[PDB]
């Protein structure tokens, strides 16, 4: 069935730590454990090995990503900016 | 078109002769009752002739410039064909597919390719073929 | 693109670009007050003194 009304992955912490802290960590805990589509084989096999280090269980290709998410907002916009800066160096 | 002709040079991909260069002597693009898969007969060089250099002796160069050939039926996908070609006879009378049941007739197909590859090494023709792929 | 920076200005002192656009748009919607309202210099190449003195002569 549907077991819990509005606690998810953070049902494991019971009554402890407060709602608005457990409400915060749920948005993280979902993402860091979520399987992502490997951009090198297409398979949903990117799992977080450790902090900032993401591993394709199919490619055996390790990526240096964000702590709780595969891609961070900052790292993407830098990759877009470094691209755009390189479009001006060579023109 | 169909490129897997008996004029082709071929990188042996799998097996004991891994990374060796070989000449297709026969192409069977649709296999027999014995071999369902599409298979080629190749004759290549197990031991390459070592890198030879001026200020080596004529007796030393001859010793140094010795081909040890193999003759082997492979699958097509256990070979890697290339743009190169070695237009060398390698007669069908000896280098043949009735070579693997009789062991002495494999020593002669091994022996024939040895005489054929050693002479065209000495000419300097197809000098890519007689140097080992560096993997 | 089709000619050099000395030969564009002798098109820019008249309306050689501001007349060409006016005529070639009469068939789409006939428009009157066409100029090239501004030209902004962005990228000059490496400065050689000879080409400058060639503009002054």
């Amino acid at each position: 069935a549907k077991r819990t009304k509005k606690v998810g992955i953070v049902g494991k912490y019971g009554t402890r730590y407060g709602a608005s802290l457990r409400k915060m960590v749920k948005k993280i805990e979902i993402s860091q454990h979520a399987k992502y589509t490997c951009s090198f084989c297409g398979k949903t096999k990117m799992k977080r090995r450790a902090v900032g280090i993401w591993h394709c269980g199919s490619c055996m290709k390790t990526v240096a990503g964000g702590a709780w998410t595969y891609n961070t907002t900052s790292a993407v916009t830098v990759k877009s900016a470094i691209r755009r800066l390189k479009e001006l160096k060579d023109q | 078109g169909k490129f897997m002709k008996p004029g082709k040079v071929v990188l042996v991909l799998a097996g004991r002769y891994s990374g060796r260069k070989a000449v297709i002597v026969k192409n069977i693009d649709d296999g027999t009752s014995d071999r369902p898969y599409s298979h080629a007969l190749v004759a290549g060089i197990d031991r390459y002739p070592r890198k030879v250099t001026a200020a080596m002796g004529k007796k030393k160069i001859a010793k140094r410039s010795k081909i040890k050939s193999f003759v082997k039926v492979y699958n097509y996908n256990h070979l890697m064909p290339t743009r190169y070609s070695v237009d060398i006879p390698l007669d069908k009378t000896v280098v043949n597919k009735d070579v693997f049941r009789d062991p002495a007739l494999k020593r002669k197909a091994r022996r024939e390719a040895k005489v054929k590859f050693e002479e065209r090494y000495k000419t300097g023709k197809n000098k890519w073929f007689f140097q080992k792929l560096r993997f | 693109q089709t000619n050099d920076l000395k030969e564009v200005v002798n098109k820019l002192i008249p309306d050689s670009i501001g007349k060409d656009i006016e005529k070639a748009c009469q068939s789409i919607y006939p428009l009157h007050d066409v100029f090239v309202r501004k030209v902004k210099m962005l990228k000059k190449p490496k400065f050689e003194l000879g080409k400058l003195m060639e503009l002054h002569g």
Partner: protein
């Protein structure tokens, strides 16, 4: 494959053939990654000639 899974100081006793497979990079590299590097060795070394021949035929018109 083809190599005995045994405590590493025992390897002195084992015969040569118990410690490798009869192939290029035998008992050192897998068959899969050898024959993908026979391809990678080749198609790079070919691509060298593709830019080698273009180098002179990009020069020669000047």
């Amino acid at each position: 494959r083809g190599v005995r899974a045994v405590r590493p100081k025992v390897l002195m006793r084992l015969s040569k053939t118990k410690k490798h497979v009869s192939r290029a990079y035998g008992g050192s590299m897998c068959a899969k990654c050898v024959r993908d590097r026979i391809k990678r060795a080749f198609l790079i070394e070919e691509q060298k000639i593709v830019v080698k021949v273009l180098k002179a035929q990009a020069q020669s018109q000047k």
